[PDB]
Structures are given as C-alpha cells and as structure tokens.
C-alpha cells in the first residue's frame, strides 16, 4: 500500500505524528524516489520533507524508518548539486556519520552510500564530509583481517565512497585525509572483486592527478607493481583507471617514471597501443609521450621493449586524438634521444606517417611535427646525412607539404617551415 503515493499524501503521513504512519509515508517516498522515469525529487524538496527525513535518521528505536529515510535521502543526494545541497542543508551529514555505527548492516551501508553521493558532488562537500569526521568510522568498517568476510555489495559501496573522498581538485583532498585513507586503499587494490578493483584504481588515479608530492605519497606506498598487474586485466573497467593512474604517475619526476618502468609496465603496451577501445589507445599513447620525455636510458627501455614500431603504428593509423599524442611522443623522443636512438626511429619508418599528418587542420600538431623534423635533421647533421633525409621527405610527399605550410596562417608554423626549406631543401 506504499506504491504510487502522491507527494501530498506523503506529506500528510509524515505530519501525522504517528510513527507508523510516518514510516509508511517515508517508505512511499522512498519508492517514489526509486523509480527510473523522473523521480519527483524537486517536489519532495519543496514539500519541506528533507528535515523530517533527516530527523528520522536519529530514531534509533525505529530502525525501519532510519533505513527508509536514509534511502530516500540517498536518492535525493544522487541528483544535481542543488539537490545534494538540499540534503546537506537539512543537516544530513552528521546524521549519516552517526548511522555508520548502526548495528544494522543495511542501514550503515545506506549511510555509506549517502555520504558517497554528498562527497562526490565536489571538493567543498567532500571536505565538509571530512571535517564532520567521516573517515574514521568509514575505515573502521573495513578493519577486518580478511575483506572476503564482508558482504560484496557492502564492500563495493565502501570502496566507491572512499574513492569519492579522494576525488576532485582545486583543492585536492587534505593531505592528512589522503595519508589516513591510503593504507586501506592499498588493501582494497589487492582484493579479488572486479568492482572493488576498478573503484580502488579510480581512487588512486585521482590521488595521482596532481603535483609530484601527491604522486610521491602514492608511489611510496609501493602500489605501482600492483597497478601494472591490473594494467593487464581483461576487464576494461579495471584497465581504464589503472592506465589513468600509471599515466598520471609518469607525469612526475624521472625517478617516479622509473618505478613504472621497473615494475614492467612497458611489456603491456603492445596490447594497449593496439587496444580496440579508442580511449585506451589515446591514454596509452599519452603515457608513452611522457615516458619519451624522460631520460635517454628510459627512451632506451622503450626501444628495448619493441615499442617504437607500435608508435609508428599509431602515428600511421589511429583516432586523430591518438595520432596527436603519438606526434608528441615522437617530438619528445627526438628532443631527448641520442643520435643512435633517433636513427633507429627513422629506420622503423617514422618519416612517412609524420609527413602524412601535416595534412591535418590542427595547428598544434603541425608545430609538434615540424619540431620533430627539426630534431631529426639535427641528428642527421651530426652524421652528415641531411641529404638522404631530405630525399626521404621528398619521396613520400613531405616536401610538398612543408612548403604548402609556408603559406600557413599561424605564425611559427610558417617560420619553422621556411627555416626547414631554406636550410635543407635549398
């Protein structure tokens, strides 16, 4: 009899001051807010029901109305920022944190879920949830010798909520909160559930999306080898955040990049750079570009792993945004590499797919490619073989492209293209 109530009826029951009438109206609200097609969230809000739901969270004597109001508030909080804000403005945050200590597992889980929605709205609500003290009782729910004894859905909700506490920037989460959470994240990163693993990887990807000090906090916990293992998973929902995390780490120092290499990550990149999912290829190529921006011994490990032909591959055919990251990978390679490494790059066939991308109507990739050509010619000057490279570029139609580019519109495109022709084709 709690199916398809009007908002007016729900208000009538909740205002009745009959606890059981209130419980049935709250359950009716929960079923309303649980429907797929446009749940009347805003009408529930405007009816003034949120403070009453929040008050019901504290009725320890009537656990069913705690659960129903928690569920109703969870679904309101899952909406827009204004809808989440209505939940927070009703005082729900400390009331949900108190519910984390509920002896009923289905009620504390609902509190975990609700706080995940609130924290996931943005850094302000994330930090407000942290200021109200949510981290200690959340982590206490995971203080068991073996995570496998916890209910699967329960563990998945805790992991997801912890990942939202790690999420968002400007500002990033408080350093103290990250250090408090990280040891539990590391443990969840070794759990056997694919959804726990995915959300753990997402959390790590958030924490590594920042300056080197943030990256260092994660790398020092020793998780890179486990991230690399998850890089090789068959589940795309795991590979995607694992790769994002690895890519974030290699934006840091050369020493942090070396940990990724030392863990064996380059051996997975043959598959990643030919992955059928466009986003994986783009992220993997972007990651490669930040590795080819490292030291020469790191460029050398890219060579040793046979990854240069795979870079030639993505430059030759891929989604355009992937080809753009490949261009960056080549320019970084040629800027920091030895002469021998640059020679090997030409021997693997980089010139023709480089020239073909000068037809692209993207002015930045043109500058990137022109830079790489300059870098390759500079290595050819040290060998006295600029002529043979000029013939190569002409034979594949590149010279026609480069001098079409002297009539280009954007400044350093035409300056660089004249400098090439004046110096090597004249």
């Amino acid at each position: 009899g709690t199916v398809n109530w009007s908002v007016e009826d729900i208000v009538k029951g909740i205002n009745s001051n009959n606890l059981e009438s209130q419980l049935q109206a709250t359950q009716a609200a929960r079923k309303l807010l649980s429907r797929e097609k446009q749940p009347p969230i805003d009408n529930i809000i405007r009816a003034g029901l949120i403070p009453k739901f929040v008050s019901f969270l504290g009725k320890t004597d009537c656990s069913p109305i705690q659960f129903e109001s928690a569920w109703a508030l969870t679904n309101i909080a899952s909406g827009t920022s204004e809808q989440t804000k209505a939940v927070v403005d009703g005082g729900a945050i400390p009331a949900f944190i108190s519910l984390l200590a509920s002896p009923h597992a289905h009620i504390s889980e609902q509190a975990v879920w609700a706080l995940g929605n609130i924290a996931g709205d943005g850094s302000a609500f994330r930090d407000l949830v942290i200021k109200h003290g949510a981290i200690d009782p959340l982590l206490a729910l995971l203080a068991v010798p073996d995570l496998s004894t916890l209910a699967c859905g329960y563990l998945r909700n805790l992991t997801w909520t912890l990942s939202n506490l790690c999420r968002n920037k400007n500002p990033a989460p408080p350093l103290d909160a990250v250090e408090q959470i990280l040891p539990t994240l590391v443990r969840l990163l070794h759990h056997n559930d694919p959804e726990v693993l995915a959300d753990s990887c997402w959390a790590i990807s958030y924490l590594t999306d920042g300056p080197n000090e943030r990256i260092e906090m994660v790398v020092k916990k020793g998780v890179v080898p486990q991230l690399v293992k998850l890089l090789g998973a068959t589940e795309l929902p795991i590979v995607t955040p694992a790769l994002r995390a690895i890519g974030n780490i290699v934006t840091g120092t050369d020493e942090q990049t070396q940990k990724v290499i030392d863990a064996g990550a380059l051996a997975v990149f043959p598959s990643l750079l030919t992955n059928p999912k466009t986003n994986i290829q783009k992220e993997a190529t972007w990651t490669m570009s930040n590795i080819t921006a490292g030291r020469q011994d790191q460029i050398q490990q890219v060579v040793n792993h046979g990854l240069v032909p795979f870079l030639v591959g993505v430059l030759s055919k891929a989604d355009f945004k992937t080809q753009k990251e490949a261009a960056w990978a080549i320019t970084n390679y040629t800027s920091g590499g030895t002469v021998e490494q640059i020679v090997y790059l030409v021997h693997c066939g980089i010139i023709e797919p480089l020239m073909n991308l000068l037809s692209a109507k993207d002015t930045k990739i043109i500058q990137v490619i022109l830079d790489a050509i300059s870098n390759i010619f500079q290595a050819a000057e040290k060998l006295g073989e600029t002529e043979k490279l000029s013939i190569m570029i002409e034979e594949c139609g590149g010279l026609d492209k480069i001098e079409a580019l002297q009539r280009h519109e954007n400044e350093s495109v035409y300056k660089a293209s004249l400098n090439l022709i004046e110096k090597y084709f004249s």
Binding site: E36, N75, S78, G79, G116, N117, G120, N164
Partner: peptide, 6 residues
C-alpha cells in the same frame, strides 16, 4: 559520480 539506489 553519484549513484541512486533503485
């Protein structure tokens, strides 16, 4: 990311 419970 936010998640409603259906």
């Amino acid at each position: 990311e936010k998640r409603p419970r259906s």
